[PDB]
């Protein structure tokens, strides 16, 4: 855990896109939740309730670290995509968010040089990964299929 | 709802492997968290609020039942095991972390004894179980398969 | 710094005072806190098989 | 890139193995899935006989040649070679080694220039 | 599984050429054509139905889906001589169509 954490950031999309795992075991674990996690009482835990200012501001750290985690993963399940680091989808690629062709960016960009080009493009993607989902329920709800 | 919570601790492996949804189903939901949710007010919350101590130490509680939950589904989901009880994975079995026959642990063990006896090799065989998925994924990308 | 002086060119530097802030912006000026976000979407060859 | 070349008899006669082989120069066939071996007869048109994947050995043949084609490689040679039991006249053709490239972000072919074989 | 017509075109230099090809089952967008010169091997030049290979003229592209495809060459040229080929890749049998030839007068 956290051996790696960034390590693939200035690495190509391609090369990156095999260490999905390392960034995503660092999601809900930082070092307060485990030591939350103990058999044996953290001790510290009374500086926490004497001053309760301190238990709450812990405790929104925790809380968001969990709400953020939740969100993205119901975004995966109405997307159609229940668990995996990588899945396929059926909305084509307009090629007016980005132009450019798989050999250039899988191998040339970063993802945090792609994140920058297609950023403003988030939420129409989004919208159409949700209504494709939603369109392949509705064709699934029919015994005679395709 | 925990007519028989550990009620397979002194069974072996294989009867009590077939109650698992008895232990699932009583990790999110302890008497607090059943209160929390009812129609009514629970009328008890002024008493939380008035002294704050107590209502910190609750939401510890209950933070915490939350981060536990998550984090092992987490674990399976990287594993490649999203949902299920029980799932195949493509590790091997060492026969150095334990080494006994199937007749003799699923029949002579009870889960209890089990987890005394590989507990040093716990991560060892979590890493290999994360290195399999990957492994599977990188051969997902592939068109031709195996 | 005390401002200009003359045509001499000079500079005089004298003991500041400030915000206690500055004394943590001798120690931290290495360090920024960054926001992670894990989804992101790319073009690919493959399509979703519908089975 | 690699560049594939193609060897073997171009006369076989009926109920006899045809043996084909093919070098690899460019890349190895210890990895690099996707080796495979293509036919082009005359009146028929272009079909598929099979490949293999190099990193494992495993293969997938064309239903057709399911009980009749044997592919296999030899990776200290760097080469990789077709075998088709039971050969008869219907199976004069021009084969051909191939690499096939497919995948979520290249797709590309290499063929080599093939071997004509006549069938008896 | 791929049926290509017609078997062959005659055209004048500079014409459009039109090649259709008809699946027999679903072949989603994964169709591929392939161009071979007399006593060359085949050369991949459109993948995905209308995706480019590296290194090919834009006088070439393609459109269809599930059953239906066109392979076309604009403004075609004399270079342009060549048995065009329907390839299947949705399925394993990986079927081939029978190959059709373009002919430049």
């Known amino acids: 855990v956290f051996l790696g954490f960034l390590g693939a950031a200035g690495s190509t999309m391609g090369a990156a896109s095999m260490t999905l795992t390392v960034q995503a075991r660092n999601l809900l674990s930082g070092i307060v939740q485990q030591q939350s996690n103990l058999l044996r009482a953290p001790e510290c835990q009374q500086h926490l309730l004497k001053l309760t200012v301190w238990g709450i501001k812990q405790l929104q750290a925790r809380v968001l670290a969990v709400e953020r985690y939740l969100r993205d993963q119901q975004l995966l399940g109405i997307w159609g995509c229940s668990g995996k680091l990588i899945c396929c989808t059926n909305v084509p690629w307009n090629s007016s968010w980005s132009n450019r062709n798989l050999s250039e960016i899988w191998d040339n960009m970063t993802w945090l040089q792609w994140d920058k080009e297609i950023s403003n493009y988030t939420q129409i993607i989004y919208g159409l990964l949700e209504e494709s989902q939603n369109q392949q329920e509705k064709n699934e709800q029919d015994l005679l299929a395709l | 709802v925990f007519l028989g919570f550990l009620g397979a601790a002194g069974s072996t492996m294989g009867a009590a492997s077939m109650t698992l949804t008895v232990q699932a189903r009583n990790l999110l939901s302890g008497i607090v968290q059943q209160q929390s949710n009812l129609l009514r007010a629970p009328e008890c919350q002024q008493h939380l609020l008035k002294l704050t101590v107590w209502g910190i130490k609750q939401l510890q509680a209950r933070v915490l039942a939350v981060e536990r939950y998550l984090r092992d589904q987490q674990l399976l989901g990287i594993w490649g095991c999203s949902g299920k009880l029980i799932c195949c994975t493509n590790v091997p079995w060492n026969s150095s972390w334990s080494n006994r026959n199937l007749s003799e642990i699923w029949d002579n063990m009870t889960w209890l004894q089990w987890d005394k006896e590989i507990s040093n090799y716990t991560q060892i065989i979590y890493g290999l179980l994360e290195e399999s998925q990957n492994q599977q994924e990188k051969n997902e990308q592939d068109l031709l398969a195996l | 710094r005390d401002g200009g002086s003359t045509n001499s060119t000079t500079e005089t530097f004298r003991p500041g005072g400030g915000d206690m802030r500055d004394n943590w912006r001798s120690e931290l000026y290495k360090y920024k806190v960054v926001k992670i976000e894990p989804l992101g979407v790319a073009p690919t060859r493959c399509k979703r098989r519908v089975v | 890139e690699v560049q594939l070349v193609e060897s073997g008899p171009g006369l076989v006669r009926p109920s006899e193995t045809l043996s084909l082989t093919c070098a690899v120069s460019?890349?190895?066939?210890?990895?690099?899935?996707?080796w495979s071996w293509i036919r082009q007869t005359p009146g028929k048109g272009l079909e598929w006989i099979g490949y293999?994947?190099?990193?494992?050995?495993?293969?997938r043949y064309n239903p057709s040649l399911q009980s009749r084609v044997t592919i296999s490689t030899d990776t200290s040679g760097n080469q990789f070679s077709l075998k088709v039991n039971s050969v008869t006249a219907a199976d004069t053709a021009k084969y051909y080694c191939?690499?096939?490239?497919?995948?979520?972000?290249?797709?590309?072919?290499?063929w080599g220039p093939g071997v004509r074989v006549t069938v008896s | 599984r791929m049926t290509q017509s017609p078997a062959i075109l005659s055209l004048s230099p500079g014409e459009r050429a039109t090649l259709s090809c008809r699946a027999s089952?679903?072949?989603?967008?994964?169709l591929a054509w392939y161009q071979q010169k007399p006593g060359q091997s085949p050369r991949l030049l459109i993948y995905?139905?209308?995706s480019r290979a590296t290194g090919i003229p834009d006088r070439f592209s393609g459109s269809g889906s599930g059953t239906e495809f066109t392979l076309t060459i604009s403004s075609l040229e004399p270079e342009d001589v060549a048995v065009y080929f329907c390839?299947?890749?949705?399925?394993?049998?990986?079927?081939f169509g029978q190959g059709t030839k373009v002919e430049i007068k």
């Open positions: 191939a690499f096939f490239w497919s995948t979520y972000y290249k797709r590309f072919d290499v």
């Open positions: 460019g890349d190895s066939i210890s990895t690099n899935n996707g």
């Open positions: 293999i994947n190099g990193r494992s050995g495993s293969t």
């Open positions: 089952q679903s072949v989603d967008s994964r």
């Open positions: 995905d139905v209308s």
């Open positions: 390839h299947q890749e949705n399925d394993w049998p990986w079927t």
